[PDB]
RNA sequence: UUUUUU
């Protein structure tokens, strides 16, 4: 019936419609199946990301080749995009054939779904370049409040740096610090608290079996391009992914896009980046940081509905300067910041956030008076102490409570 | 009969032989003879495609350098089972014809080590899926020897498994070469199982000798004699070779000795670009290093890659110190030795509190992490020197076991 | 390459 599906499912399942249908890699036998379907008059169907081309046709890509080149993809006429002034990031779905005699890949016959809707009202609705930012106003809690070793950091986050939609957060840590996995932890977080919330994980760069072990942990979009891949895989990968979180907010919906290793994608595009000379402190080109500006500068809130909100790991204290360099060019244009000490990890005491360098802005609007100056006491207290030891003072003084409960306490 | 004993055959022994049936001339001489009657001959090496499509059979005594008994391999046969750079040939073989200069593969017996037809099904390397290292690697010996102690300790400060991309650092003098050789003898005792490669790359040439006399393995090496090219290309042949062995679902351990003087090779040699890193080190320069370093991982599938190199730090530049962190962020194994521990002629000069190893309650039991937890608790106040000497007395005492049962 | 970048 559909290829996606047939394209998910094991070998020897198809095997049996084979036989039992009439009539080798999988894809023949896929194709094969689809032909004789696609002969006898029934109607075929896959589903991918919008990718308009130079040339003004586009593709569908799929997600199991993180949205590159896929012998699998779907031709867009030029004339399918007019009708529906479709864009680079639109997920769509729709009845297809097969590639005629010469045609190379299968095409799109007709559209019926355009990013999960209707595409005859996405042809009103108002462009993302055009929608009103605004600073986050609804908040994201992240202690699912579950008493557990877990909801410690998520709980300590929620009070050092709160979460808000349209959040511009940014993760700030050497090596070892824990930030990856606190990463995963916000991960898991955001998926109790808040299903509604469409969620994408962009692993830009970081490790092989950590891109796996989060797809297994993790329920949502998991793209990845682990180090094995070349600088301009990131890019391409990365690019695709924030068109699509655009194009969604687009359709008034909230998406978080949880981003590991930002400061990777930076090094990426400098490598990919035309040499101006002028090159800036830490062998960093000048204009090399214009596109990722842009890239994590996307997130926002908007006055229309939906929001963007991206959170990325930040890489500091590392011999290089470069990394310093990154680490101010996002923080100049984050809302929010969240460090972590190389210090605070070696004595294994978790999480190893370091508070006093922790904190996001207008945080006002993401919080009643009430717990607003029970933080700012919380932080007047702890300013004077050190690293290890405020975390060590901070944890154990609500490692027996709720977050609630603390403060009805304290 | 065959190629490959009578290359490393003796050049007075086989003389005997001769009368009966240049020594390069012989050895030519000699299968020429074994194939006039249509005698079989028998070769081996480690196929290296090139770009015009056909390959080359690599020898280990050439350090899979340029060989003049290569064995030749058309690109069709490579075709017929998909073969790639690195993997192991062996079959029946033809003397070269007159015109011809080299040998030539007639026929395929066994790809790496395993049946030619097998190579179709196996799934590919990069298509593998990898986890967090899931079997344990212990280099903990009963035998309780004077050397055991560095053994003992590196369980102890930081755990290996399969697939451990792990890393070792120190400045000179740190015993961290030495104690890459001790570590290769641990797991040579410990594991026969787990496929052995040791990588010397540039660093010592005396090393080069003490290692292979004295490790029971395959020992790859290139002396800092040898021109940066070299070290590249012999190293990039290795992490192949590795990457083959794994496709097989086979337990491969490269025990890499100065990486850091491999991403320095990689450096010297690479395309100019405007922007430089701090310390000298170009900025598009490590991801060749990355790669090669990233390939140790684990396997679903099967078998496993573990590359365990060592680091240098407060080397008097900062390409050193820079590029110690690079392979921090992509390893999950890291480990120190201090020179003011080794000062005191203290080892292992191992620095427990700088130590560790990622997701280790995996590797290690939950009582194994409780004791490890606490350990590390105690130790962390106290000094390298002091802490260090603190632990070795008692570990003098009994194996880890014993030492934390008491305790 | 010099400047920038180290
Ligand atoms: N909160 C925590 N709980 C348990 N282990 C932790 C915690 N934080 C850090 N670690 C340890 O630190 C190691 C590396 O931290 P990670 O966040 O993966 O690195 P990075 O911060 O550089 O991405 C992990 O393998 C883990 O064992
Ligand atoms: N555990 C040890 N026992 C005895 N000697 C040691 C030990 N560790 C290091 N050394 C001494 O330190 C010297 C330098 O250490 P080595 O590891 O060989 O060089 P590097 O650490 O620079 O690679 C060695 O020649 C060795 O004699
Ligand atoms: F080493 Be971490 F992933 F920055
Ligand atoms: F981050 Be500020 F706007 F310089
Ligand atoms: F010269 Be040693 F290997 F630091
Ligand atoms: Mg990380
Ligand atoms: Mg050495």
Same mark, same amino acid.
């Given at each position: /019936?559909?290829?996606?599906?047939?394209?998910?499912?094991?070998?020897?399942?198809?095997?049996?419609?084979?036989?039992?249908?009439?009539?080798?890699?999988?894809?023949?036998i896929?194709?094969?199946?689809?032909?004789?379907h696609?002969?006898?008059?029934?109607?075929?169907?896959?589903?991918?990301?919008?990718?308009?081309?130079?040339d003004?046709?586009?593709?569908?890509?799929?997600?199991?080749?993180?949205?590159?080149?896929?012998?699998?993809?779907?031709?867009?006429?030029?004339?399918?995009?007019?009708?529906?002034?479709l864009?680079?990031?639109?997920?769509?779905?729709?009845?297809?054939?097969?590639?005629?005699?010469? #045609?190379?890949?299968?095409?799109?016959?007709?559209?019926?779904?355009?990013?999960?809707?209707?595409?005859?009202?996405?042809?009103?609705?108002?462009?993302?370049?055009?929608?009103?930012?605004?600073?986050?106003?609804?908040?994201?809690? /992240?202690?699912?409040?579950?008493?557990?070793?877990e909801?410690?950091?998520?709980?300590?986050?929620?009070?050092?740096?709160?979460?808000?939609?349209?959040?511009?957060g940014?993760?700030?840590?050497?090596?070892?610090?824990?930030?990856?996995?606190?990463?995963?932890?916000?991960?898991?977080s955001?998926?109790?608290?808040?299903?509604?919330?469409?969620?994408?994980?962009?692993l830009?760069?970081?490790?092989?079996?950590?891109?796996?072990?989060m797809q297994?942990?993790?329920?949502?979009?998991?793209?990845?391009?682990?180090?094995?891949?070349?600088?301009?895989?990131?890019?391409?990968?990365?690019?695709?992914?924030?068109?699509?979180?655009?194009?969604?907010?687009?359709?008034?919906?909230?998406?978080?896009?949880?981003?590991?290793?930002?400061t990777?994608?930076?090094?990426?595009?400098?490598?990919?980046?035309?040499?101006?000379?002028?090159?800036?402190?830490?062998?960093?080109?000048?204009?090399?940081?214009?596109?990722?500006?842009?890239?994590?500068?996307?997130?926002?809130?908007?006055?229309?509905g939906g929001?963007?909100?991206?959170?990325?790991?930040?890489?500091?204290?590392?011999?290089?300067? /470069?990394? #310093?360099?990154?680490? #101010?060019?996002?923080?100049?244009?984050?809302? /929010?910041?969240?460090?972590?000490?190389?210090?605070?990890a070696?004595?294994?005491?978790?999480?190893?956030?370091?508070?006093?360098?922790?904190?996001?802005?207008?945080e006002?609007?993401?919080?009643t008076?009430?717990?607003?100056?029970?933080?700012?006491?919380?932080?007047?207290?702890?300013?004077?102490?050190?690293?290890?030891?405020?975390?060590?003072?901070?944890?154990?003084?609500?490692?027996?409570?709720?977050?609630?409960?603390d403060?009805?306490e304290?």
């Open positions: /019936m559909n290829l996606t599906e047939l394209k998910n499912t094991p070998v020897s399942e198809l095997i049996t419609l084979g036989e039992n249908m009439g009539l080798m890699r999988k894809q023949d896929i194709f094969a199946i689809l032909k004789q696609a002969k006898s008059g029934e109607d075929i169907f896959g589903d991918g990301v919008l990718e308009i081309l130079q003004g046709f586009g593709f569908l890509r799929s997600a199991d080749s993180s949205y590159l080149a896929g012998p699998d993809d779907i031709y867009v006429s030029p004339s399918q995009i007019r009708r529906f002034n864009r680079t990031g639109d997920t769509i779905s729709g009845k297809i054939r097969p590639p005629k005699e010469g #045609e190379r890949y299968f095409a799109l016959l007709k559209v019926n779904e355009v990013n999960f809707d209707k595409p005859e009202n996405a042809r009103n609705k108002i462009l993302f370049e055009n929608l009103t930012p605004l600073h986050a106003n609804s908040r994201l809690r /992240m202690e699912r409040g579950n008493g557990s070793t909801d410690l950091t998520a709980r300590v986050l929620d009070l050092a740096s709160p979460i808000g939609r349209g959040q511009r940014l993760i700030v840590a050497p090596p070892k610090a824990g930030k990856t996995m606190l990463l995963q932890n916000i991960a898991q955001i998926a109790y608290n808040h299903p509604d919330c469409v969620l994408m994980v962009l830009i760069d970081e490790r092989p079996e950590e891109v796996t072990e297994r942990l993790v329920k949502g979009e998991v793209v990845a391009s682990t180090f094995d891949e070349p600088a301009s895989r990131h890019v391409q990968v990365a690019e695709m992914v924030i068109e699509k979180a655009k194009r969604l907010v687009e359709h008034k919906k909230d998406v978080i896009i949880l981003l590991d290793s930002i990777r994608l930076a090094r990426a595009y400098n490598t990919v980046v035309p040499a101006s000379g002028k090159v800036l402190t830490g062998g960093v080109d000048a204009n090399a940081l214009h596109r990722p500006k842009r890239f994590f500068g996307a997130a926002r809130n908007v006055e229309e929001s963007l909100t991206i959170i990325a790991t930040a890489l500091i204290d590392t011999g290089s300067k /470069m990394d #310093e360099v990154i680490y #101010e060019e996002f923080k100049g244009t984050g809302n /929010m910041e969240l460090h972590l000490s190389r210090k605070i070696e004595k294994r005491v978790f999480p190893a956030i370091d508070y006093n360098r922790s904190g996001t802005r207008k006002e609007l993401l919080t008076q009430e717990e607003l100056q029970k933080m700012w006491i919380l932080r007047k207290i702890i300013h004077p102490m050190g690293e290890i030891d405020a975390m060590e003072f901070l944890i154990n003084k609500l490692a027996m409570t709720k977050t609630n409960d403060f009805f304290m």
